[PDB]
Amino acid sequence: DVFLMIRRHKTTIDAKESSTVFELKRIVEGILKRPPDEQRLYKDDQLLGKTLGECGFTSQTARPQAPATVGLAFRATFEALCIEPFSSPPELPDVMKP
Amino acid sequence: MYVKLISSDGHEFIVKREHALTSGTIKAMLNEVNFREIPSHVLSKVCMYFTYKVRYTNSIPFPIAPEIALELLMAANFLD
Amino acid sequence: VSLKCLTEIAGVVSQYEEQFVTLFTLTMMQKQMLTNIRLAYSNDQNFIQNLSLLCTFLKEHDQLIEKLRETLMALHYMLLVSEVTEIFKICLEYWNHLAAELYRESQLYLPMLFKVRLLMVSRMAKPNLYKNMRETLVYLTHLDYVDTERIMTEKLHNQVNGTEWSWKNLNTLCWAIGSISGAMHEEDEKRFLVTVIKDLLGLCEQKRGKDNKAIIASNIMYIVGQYPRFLRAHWKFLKTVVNKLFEFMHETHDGVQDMACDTFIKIAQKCRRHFVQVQVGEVMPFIDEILNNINTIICDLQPQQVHTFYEAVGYMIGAQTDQTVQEHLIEKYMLLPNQVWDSIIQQATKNVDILKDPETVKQLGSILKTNVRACKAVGHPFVIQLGRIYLDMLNVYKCLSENISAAIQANGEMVTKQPLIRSMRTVKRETLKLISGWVSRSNDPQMVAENFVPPLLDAVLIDYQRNVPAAREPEVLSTMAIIVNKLGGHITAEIPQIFDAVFECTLNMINKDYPEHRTNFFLLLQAVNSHCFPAFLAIPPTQFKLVLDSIIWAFKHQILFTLLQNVASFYQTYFCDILQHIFILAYMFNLVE
Amino acid sequence: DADCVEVNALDGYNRTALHYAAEKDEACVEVLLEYGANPNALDGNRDTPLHWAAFKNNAECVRALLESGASVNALDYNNDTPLSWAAMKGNLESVSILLDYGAEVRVINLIGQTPISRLVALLVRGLGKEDSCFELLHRAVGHFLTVLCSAPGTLKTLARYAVRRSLGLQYLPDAVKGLPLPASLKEYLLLLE
Ligand SMILES: *[C@@H](CC(=O)OC(C)C)n1cnc(-c2ccccc2)n1
């Protein structure tokens, strides 16, 4: 298996490592209705037919409790990847500090 | 099939109704839900927890950080 | 000696109570002499022991002293001497007396009885002195169970803590714990047993060395063997200890197997009821499960251990009221002995020479020992196995006798003491013993006379008649007696031949000074006199005269008195002549008068 | 006897008077502590007075030791933490006190046992309040019977375990108060539910 995350702006969204990024794009199409040809995806900070195994996505790297992540863009011209980071947690109470 | 979850801070997440139903609160509420109190990081961690619970239901390897721990406890109390 | 004379004075009438008081005071005053009395004794001791005796003064005159109370609190001196086996026993006698008295009473002595309670547990002996200690202690616990449990837990912990780790202390404490059994109430029993079980398991896990673990396990097994009531309420721990004993049966160290087997059979007797029952959550009566595990459990056990395990299983089977399930239990239970027995019988029908193998006869002897134990445990329901093996067993017995004769002809009876001959004779004796067991516990002596006894006589009577006194096994007579006891009535028609073939030969062996044969003859003759006195009179006139002569030899060496009772020509023949021999008499005087 | 009682000297058994006091009563323990008895003295097997107190279930001695700075998770030569002994004997109260002091459940002794493992073994014997002790252990660990093993468990109890772990080796009942939590959740952290 390979559990994956995808992000774009404030918006967030698994397969087999043997699977390829195109079927993941098809999943993205079904979810958001932007066909794969108007989707482009980025592994790490790298703009991804590659099988998820050869994209670097591995189950040990892609567990459900620690899934992999991907950036997404659409043909608006594909926009520069815009992903808005999650809010940070507040200060840890001193009693809970190490 | 799918369901959308909005964090209090406006971050947005999508899963299958399947996983979201792991929360009793989700089942009580149900296409989309906005949690005007759950921050983005907590909501993302909860999505991870749903996926992990599904993947190891009646399987077990779950990480937690102290900073998010209290928020996670309160949010779990909220979401069953 | 001065003390002993005073002791005798104190040994002997409350009307002299003042004297009995003043004496006690003055001797107590003459404290002026006496401190570690145990030390003084250990390092003219006799004075201390005589001072202990005083013990019997208060056995009597504790009543007259109750009538100087601080001086009585003497009792401390009684403890001092108690610290000193003879002196300790002297003290223990009064301790038991006082404990029983105060217990059966329903305040003066209780404020310090705990001191004695501590003393008893400390000095507890291995299971008369032990009984007195046990009796005294159970009286004390009936005065307070709580303090007894507290003290036992304290010392058990000190052992667990390693503060006092010692085989001796462990053994004595466990002995006292076992002694308390029955005195405790069932709920307090449960609590205390749970505490002690956990503590013992703890010190078992903690301690290294298979020797230490072995002693701890033996103590645990003893204590559990002393508390069937708790085991019944905790059938879970009962199954637990059963499996643990199975484990110990596969041990090879310090005879643990034997010990385990011992423990096993004990509990097997005291809760047989429960094994034959489908207990809470059980798919089956647990006994059946054992009947399946047995093959494995015995794979490490020795023949005596096998006998003990079979006997316990037999008791448990006997607990099975349903004779159908009981038949199934017996079938499975004897199958392995039955299987080997069938193999031997098949080999015999292939060739008699199998019987002429020391190996074959030894296998048969093991089978017979197992069957004897099983019948002893089961009773009549064992009839199924008995009938299963009866005919081929008697054929084997006859073949054994034939081969005994075939050897004897070569050296006279001196073929005896040859190991094969010894084994064959032992096998015949055990066969007779098994027959005796079941027949004594037979349901229908008519059925026995129809199916069992006549073939037995065919195999036994004429053979014994033709045999030589050593091959003429005494047990035969015993068996016959038991037959007479059961087949009283039916047995009548067989009495003549029985005496024709056997009574003559044993009489030849009895008129001499074969003691077991002679004792069996006494009992068998009295049995014939009682059960079948009509047959007794019907004895042929020659054999009847020989019977009277045997009686004469006997009391010339109760049966005569029995004959006098029953017989009420004979008198003018024997009574007149026997009168001089005996010179009952009131009976004789009554008869003539 | 508190009235009857170098205090920290290890005796011929290599143990302190405080060990005996712990095995006997909390009053003597308190008197010794007042006289400066070291709670963390290690005996001939490096079992603390806390270890024996926990085994004896002398809960009052346990609380007195812990309140005086006892080493909650000291490891003897067998490396059995006092929780390990308390669990292997299966007594409840002292186990609860240890859990409130944040004793570590997830531990392994040289024997290769966990305290919950030993408690489970005791329960299997049918001798076992012991069910409540098992319940406290389960709530403290959150997840470790088969269903409780195959079930990943609630996110809630996982968060509770993480929070307690963060609180560390201090008195949890007092610490949880400072947390900005409803009284219900503060109680939940203390495994009272
Ligand atoms: C501890 C281990 C043991 O078996 O000791 C020796 C190696 C034989 N032990 C002793 N007795 C027991 C026990 C357990 C369950 C039921 C009865 C006795 N365990």
Swiss-Prot record, chain A:
GO-annotated biological processes: positive regulation of proteasomal ubiquitin-dependent protein catabolic process; protein ubiquitination; protein-containing complex assembly; target-directed miRNA degradation; transcription elongation by RNA polymerase II; transcription initiation at RNA polymerase II promoter
Residue ranges of every copy of the Ubiquitin-like domain listed in the record: 1-61
SUPFAM superfamilies in the cross-refs: Ubiquitin-like
Primary location recorded for the protein, binned into one broad class: nucleus
Pfam family name, one: ubiquitin
Gene Ontology cellular component terms for the protein in this record: Cul2-RING ubiquitin ligase complex; Cul5-RING ubiquitin ligase complex; cytosol; elongin complex; nucleoplasm; VCB complex
Modified residues (Phosphothreonine): 77
Gene Ontology MF terms: transcription corepressor binding; ubiquitin protein ligase binding
PROSITE patterns, A to Z: UBIQUITIN_2
Source taxon at top rank: Eukaryota
InterPro entries cross-referenced by the UniProt entry: ELOB, Ubiquitin-like_dom, Ubiquitin-like_domsf
Pathways involved: Protein modification; protein ubiquitination
Location relative to the cell: Nucleus
Keywords: Acetylation, Host-virus interaction, Nucleus, Phosphoprotein, Transcription, Transcription regulation, Ubl conjugation pathway
Family from the record: Belongs to the Elongin B family.
Subunit structure: Heterotrimer of an A (ELOA, ELOA2 or ELOA3P), ELOB and ELOC subunit. The elongin BC complex interacts with EPOP; leading to recruit the elongin BC complex to Polycomb group (PcG) target genes, thereby restricting excessive activity of the PRC2/EED-EZH2 complex.
Name of the protein in question: Elongin-B
Origin species: Homo sapiens (Human)
Taxonomic lineage of the native organism: Eukaryota, Metazoa, Chordata, Craniata, Vertebrata
Gene from which this protein is expressed: ELOB
UniProtKB/Swiss-Prot annotation, chain B:
The protein's annotated pathway: Protein modification; protein ubiquitination
One function term, GO molecular function aspect: protein-macromolecule adaptor activity
Principal location: nucleus
Location of the protein in the cell: Nucleus
PTM remark: Ubiquitinated by the DCX(AMBRA1) complex, leading to its degradation by the proteasome.
GO BP term, example: regulation of transcription by RNA polymerase II
Tissue: Overexpressed in prostate cancer cell line PC-3 and breast cancer cell line SK-BR-3.
GO CC terms: Cul2-RING ubiquitin ligase complex; Cul5-RING ubiquitin ligase complex; cytosol; elongin complex; nucleoplasm
Keyword annotations from UniProtKB, A to Z: Host-virus interaction, Nucleus, Transcription, Transcription regulation, Ubl conjugation, Ubl conjugation pathway
Subunit structure: Heterotrimer of an A (ELOA, ELOA2 or ELOA3P), ELOB and ELOC subunit. The elongin BC complex interacts with EPOP; leading to recruit the elongin BC complex to Polycomb group (PcG) target genes, thereby restricting excessive activity of the PRC2/EED-EZH2 complex.
Family: Belongs to the SKP1 family.
Protein name according to UniProt: Elongin-C
Source species: Homo sapiens (Human)
Curated annotation (Swiss-Prot), chain C:
Effect of residue 21 to E: Does not abolish Rex-mediated mRNA export
Residues that bear Phosphotyrosine: 130
Outcome, altering residue 266 to A: Enhances Ran binding activity and does not abolish nuclear export complex formation. Enhances Ran binding activity and does not abolish nuclear export complex formation
Sequence segments annotated as region (Necessary for HTLV-1 Rex multimerization): 111-114
GO cellular component: annulate lamellae; Cajal body; cytoplasm; cytosol; intracellular membrane-bounded organelle; kinetochore; membrane; nuclear envelope
Subunit structure: Found in a U snRNA export complex with PHAX/RNUXA, NCBP1/CBP80, NCBP2/CBP20, RAN, XPO1 and m7G-capped RNA. Component of a nuclear export receptor complex composed of KPNB1, RAN, SNUPN and XPO1. Found in a trimeric export complex with SNUPN, RAN and XPO1. Found in a nuclear export complex with RANBP3 and RAN. Found in a 60S ribosomal subunit export complex with NMD3, RAN, XPO1. Interacts with DDX3X, NMD3, NUP42, NUP88, NUP214, RANBP3 and TERT. Interacts with NEMF (via its N-terminus). Interacts with the monomeric form of BIRC5/survivin deacetylated at 'Lys-129'. (Microbial infection) Interacts with HIV-1 Rev.
Organism: Homo sapiens
Cell compartment(s), UniProt: Cytoplasm; Nucleus, Nucleoplasm; Nucleus, Cajal body; Nucleus, Nucleolus
Chain's gene name: XPO1
Phenotypic consequence of residue 71 to A: Does not abolish Rex-mediated mRNA export
Full protein name: Exportin-1
Top-level taxon: Eukaryota
Disulfide bonds: none
UniProtKB/Swiss-Prot annotation, chain D:
Keyword Phosphoprotein among UniProt keywords: yes
Native species: Homo sapiens (Human)
Tissue specificity comment: Highest level of expression in skeletal muscle. Also expressed in heart, brain, placenta, liver, kidney and pancreas.
Sequence ranges assigned to domain SOCS box in this UniProt record: 145-193
Disulfide-bond pairs as recorded: none
Keywords, sorted A to Z: ANK repeat, Cytoplasm, Phosphoprotein, Repeat, Ubl conjugation pathway
ANK repeat ranges per the UniProt record: 13-41, 45-74, 78-107
Pathway(s) this gene product operates in, as recorded in its UniProt entry: Protein modification; protein ubiquitination
UniProt PTM: Phosphorylated by TBK1.
Domain of life assignment: Eukaryota
GO biological process terms on file: intracellular signal transduction; protein ubiquitination
Protein name as it appears in the record: Ankyrin repeat and SOCS box protein 8
A GO cellular-component term linked to this record: cytosol
Residues of the full protein shown: 65 to 288 of 288
Cellular localisation: Cytoplasm
Quaternary state and interactors: Interacts with TBK1; this interaction promotes TBK1 proteasomal degradation.
Stated role: May be a substrate-recognition component of a SCF-like ECS (Elongin-Cullin-SOCS-box protein) E3 ubiquitin-protein ligase complex which mediates the ubiquitination and subsequent proteasomal degradation of target proteins. Inhibits IFN-beta production through the IRF3 signaling pathway by targeting TBK1 via 'Lys-48'-linked ubiquitination, leading to its proteasomal degradation.
Domain notes for this protein: The SOCS box domain mediates the interaction with the Elongin BC complex, an adapter module in different E3 ubiquitin-protein ligase complexes.
Record's keyword annotation contains Phosphoprotein: yes
Gene: ASB8
Family listed: Belongs to the ankyrin SOCS box (ASB) family.
Residues in coiled coil: none
